[PDB]
Design a protein around this motif. Structure first.
Motif, mmCIF file in Angstrom:
data_model
loop_
_atom_site.group_PDB
_atom_site.id
_atom_site.type_symbol
_atom_site.label_atom_id
_atom_site.label_comp_id
_atom_site.label_asym_id
_atom_site.label_seq_id
_atom_site.Cartn_x
_atom_site.Cartn_y
_atom_site.Cartn_z
ATOM 1 N N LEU A 192 5.342 118.220 65.762
ATOM 2 C CA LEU A 192 4.422 119.090 66.513
ATOM 3 C C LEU A 192 4.522 118.834 68.035
ATOM 4 C CD1 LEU A 192 1.956 121.094 66.314
ATOM 5 C CD2 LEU A 192 0.538 119.043 66.157
ATOM 6 N N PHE A 193 4.455 117.565 68.410
ATOM 7 C CA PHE A 193 4.390 117.212 69.813
ATOM 8 C C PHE A 193 5.693 117.472 70.514
ATOM 9 C CE2 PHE A 193 1.332 113.481 68.785
ATOM 10 C CZ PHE A 193 0.248 114.362 68.641
ATOM 11 N N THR A 194 6.826 117.249 69.870
ATOM 12 C CA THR A 194 8.129 117.498 70.543
ATOM 13 C C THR A 194 8.423 119.007 70.571
ATOM 14 O OG1 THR A 194 9.341 117.025 68.485
ATOM 15 C CG2 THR A 194 8.990 115.271 69.896
ATOM 16 N N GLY A 195 8.077 119.735 69.511
ATOM 17 C CA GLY A 195 8.356 121.162 69.550
ATOM 18 C C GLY A 195 7.375 121.945 70.406
ATOM 19 N N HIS A 196 6.169 121.412 70.577
ATOM 20 C CA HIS A 196 5.087 122.150 71.311
ATOM 21 C C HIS A 196 4.353 121.096 72.127
ATOM 22 C CE1 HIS A 196 5.954 125.469 68.534
ATOM 23 N NE2 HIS A 196 6.054 124.522 67.608
ATOM 24 N N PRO A 197 4.890 120.741 73.330
ATOM 25 C CA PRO A 197 4.274 119.659 74.101
ATOM 26 C C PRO A 197 2.862 119.954 74.592
ATOM 27 C CG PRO A 197 6.556 119.904 74.704
ATOM 28 C CD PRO A 197 6.222 121.104 73.847
ATOM 29 N N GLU A 198 2.452 121.226 74.592
ATOM 30 C CA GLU A 198 1.037 121.558 74.942
ATOM 31 C C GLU A 198 0.095 120.953 73.922
ATOM 32 O OE1 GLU A 198 3.410 123.567 73.678
ATOM 33 O OE2 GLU A 198 2.612 125.358 72.740
ATOM 34 N N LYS B 160 -3.224 128.968 66.957
ATOM 35 C CA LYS B 160 -1.751 128.870 67.056
ATOM 36 C C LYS B 160 -1.271 127.460 66.709
ATOM 37 C CE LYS B 160 2.098 131.059 68.517
ATOM 38 N NZ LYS B 160 2.476 132.171 67.644
ATOM 39 N N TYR B 161 -2.040 126.449 67.145
ATOM 40 C CA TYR B 161 -1.566 125.059 66.917
ATOM 41 C C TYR B 161 -1.619 124.748 65.411
ATOM 42 C CZ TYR B 161 -2.261 124.149 71.936
ATOM 43 O OH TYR B 161 -2.257 124.142 73.296
ATOM 44 N N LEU B 162 -2.507 125.382 64.609
ATOM 45 C CA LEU B 162 -2.474 125.182 63.149
ATOM 46 C C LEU B 162 -1.260 125.893 62.535
ATOM 47 C CD1 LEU B 162 -5.501 124.597 64.022
ATOM 48 C CD2 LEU B 162 -6.088 125.141 61.720
ATOM 49 N N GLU B 163 -0.810 127.008 63.136
ATOM 50 C CA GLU B 163 0.441 127.609 62.750
ATOM 51 C C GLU B 163 1.584 126.611 63.004
ATOM 52 O OE1 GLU B 163 1.650 130.948 65.172
ATOM 53 O OE2 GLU B 163 3.403 131.300 64.025
ATOM 54 N N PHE B 164 1.590 126.052 64.218
ATOM 55 C CA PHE B 164 2.656 125.151 64.576
ATOM 56 C C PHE B 164 2.688 123.968 63.593
ATOM 57 C CE2 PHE B 164 1.920 126.004 69.415
ATOM 58 C CZ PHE B 164 2.569 127.218 69.346
ATOM 59 N N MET C 198 3.584 126.144 49.060
ATOM 60 C CA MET C 198 3.025 125.341 50.133
ATOM 61 C C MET C 198 2.679 126.199 51.354
ATOM 62 S SD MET C 198 1.815 122.489 51.168
ATOM 63 C CE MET C 198 2.322 121.364 50.067
ATOM 64 N N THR C 199 3.605 127.085 51.708
ATOM 65 C CA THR C 199 3.362 127.979 52.820
ATOM 66 C C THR C 199 2.122 128.814 52.606
ATOM 67 O OG1 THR C 199 5.746 128.100 53.257
ATOM 68 C CG2 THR C 199 4.485 129.893 54.122
ATOM 69 N N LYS C 200 1.935 129.382 51.403
ATOM 70 C CA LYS C 200 0.708 130.145 51.083
ATOM 71 C C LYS C 200 -0.535 129.255 51.233
ATOM 72 C CE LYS C 200 0.213 133.338 47.910
ATOM 73 N NZ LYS C 200 0.394 134.117 46.591
ATOM 74 N N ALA C 201 -0.468 128.006 50.772
ATOM 75 C CA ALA C 201 -1.656 127.133 50.822
ATOM 76 C C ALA C 201 -2.036 126.870 52.265
ATOM 77 C CB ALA C 201 -1.395 125.832 50.055
ATOM 78 N N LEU C 202 -1.052 126.631 53.099
ATOM 79 C CA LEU C 202 -1.289 126.357 54.497
ATOM 80 C C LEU C 202 -1.732 127.593 55.262
ATOM 81 C CD1 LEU C 202 1.753 124.058 55.149
ATOM 82 C CD2 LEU C 202 -0.595 123.287 54.904
ATOM 83 N N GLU C 203 -1.218 128.742 54.855
ATOM 84 C CA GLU C 203 -1.771 130.019 55.399
ATOM 85 C C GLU C 203 -3.262 130.166 55.003
ATOM 86 O OE1 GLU C 203 1.190 132.625 53.712
ATOM 87 O OE2 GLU C 203 2.396 132.563 55.573
ATOM 88 N N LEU C 204 -3.631 129.899 53.769
ATOM 89 C CA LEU C 204 -5.002 129.977 53.383
ATOM 90 C C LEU C 204 -5.922 129.067 54.197
ATOM 91 C CD1 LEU C 204 -7.181 131.137 51.431
ATOM 92 C CD2 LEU C 204 -6.541 129.220 49.853
ATOM 93 N N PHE C 205 -5.466 127.836 54.366
ATOM 94 C CA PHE C 205 -6.182 126.868 55.189
ATOM 95 C C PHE C 205 -6.392 127.412 56.595
ATOM 96 C CE2 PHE C 205 -5.368 123.306 58.323
ATOM 97 C CZ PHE C 205 -6.518 122.634 58.254
ATOM 98 N N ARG C 206 -5.322 127.869 57.257
ATOM 99 C CA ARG C 206 -5.567 128.298 58.621
ATOM 100 C C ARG C 206 -6.321 129.602 58.724
ATOM 101 N NH1 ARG C 206 -0.090 128.705 58.555
ATOM 102 N NH2 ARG C 206 0.649 130.770 59.172
ATOM 103 N N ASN C 207 -6.193 130.477 57.716
ATOM 104 C CA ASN C 207 -6.909 131.718 57.747
ATOM 105 C C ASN C 207 -8.440 131.499 57.635
ATOM 106 O OD1 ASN C 207 -7.650 134.576 55.954
ATOM 107 N ND2 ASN C 207 -6.461 134.711 57.902
ATOM 108 N N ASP C 208 -8.811 130.547 56.825
ATOM 109 C CA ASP C 208 -10.243 130.224 56.590
ATOM 110 C C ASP C 208 -10.806 129.516 57.824
ATOM 111 O OD1 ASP C 208 -10.319 131.607 54.189
ATOM 112 O OD2 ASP C 208 -10.410 129.808 52.961
ATOM 113 N N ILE C 209 -9.985 128.684 58.502
ATOM 114 C CA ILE C 209 -10.390 128.130 59.802
ATOM 115 C C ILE C 209 -10.548 129.313 60.770
ATOM 116 C CG2 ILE C 209 -9.715 126.765 61.746
ATOM 117 C CD1 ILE C 209 -8.475 124.898 59.657
ATOM 118 N N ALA C 210 -9.581 130.234 60.790
ATOM 119 C CA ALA C 210 -9.609 131.330 61.752
ATOM 120 C C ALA C 210 -10.873 132.148 61.583
ATOM 121 C CB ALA C 210 -8.402 132.248 61.557
#
Length: 152
Positions: A32-38, A102-106, A131-143
């Protein structure tokens, strides 16, 4: 939602993570930190890490990788029934930590990347889909909680 068979694949993959929760968590945060230093800049306690070797040498970064992935793991084991784990986690992240969705996407993408790097050939297409679906669900519910709070 995910099907029963998809949840079973998510939680089967998560057993790989649980064999070395700290090393997965460290490698996910480093990705995360190397690909997205923000995203590093949001961590006052990791801002001093200027190189990947410093990140890899940080025992406290490993510790936070454990904390992050333990939280996510507990949420994933709820198979979507996560309103309580999630709601107060979304409020902390929106209101205390000020973390764009966006950072939960990253970090979702970092988890997929790390699983392939540590388990090449053992993280197949069905497992990656689930796994991708589960992580989409997680971030969608946060969103959804972020939209309630006007952080958008």
């Amino acid at each position: 939602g995910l099907s029963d068979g998809e949840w079973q694949q998510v939680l089967n993959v998560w057993g790989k993570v649980e064999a070395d929760i700290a090393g997965h968590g460290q490698e996910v945060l480093i990705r995360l930190f190397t690909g997205h230093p923000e995203t590093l800049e949001k961590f006052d306690k990791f801002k001093h890490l200027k190189t990947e070797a410093e990140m890899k040498a940080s025992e406290d970064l490993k510790k936070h990788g454990t904390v992050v992935l333990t939280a996510l793991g507990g949420i994933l084991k709820k198979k979507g029934h996560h309103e309580a784990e999630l709601k107060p986690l979304a409020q902390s992240h929106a209101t205390k930590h000020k973390i764009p969705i966006k950072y939960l996407e990253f970090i979702s993408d970092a988890i997929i990347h790390v699983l392939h790097s540590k388990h090449p050939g053992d993280f197949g297409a069905d497992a990656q889909g689930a796994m991708t679906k589960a992580l989409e669900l997680f971030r969608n519910d946060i969103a959804a909680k972020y939209k309630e709070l006007g952080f958008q």
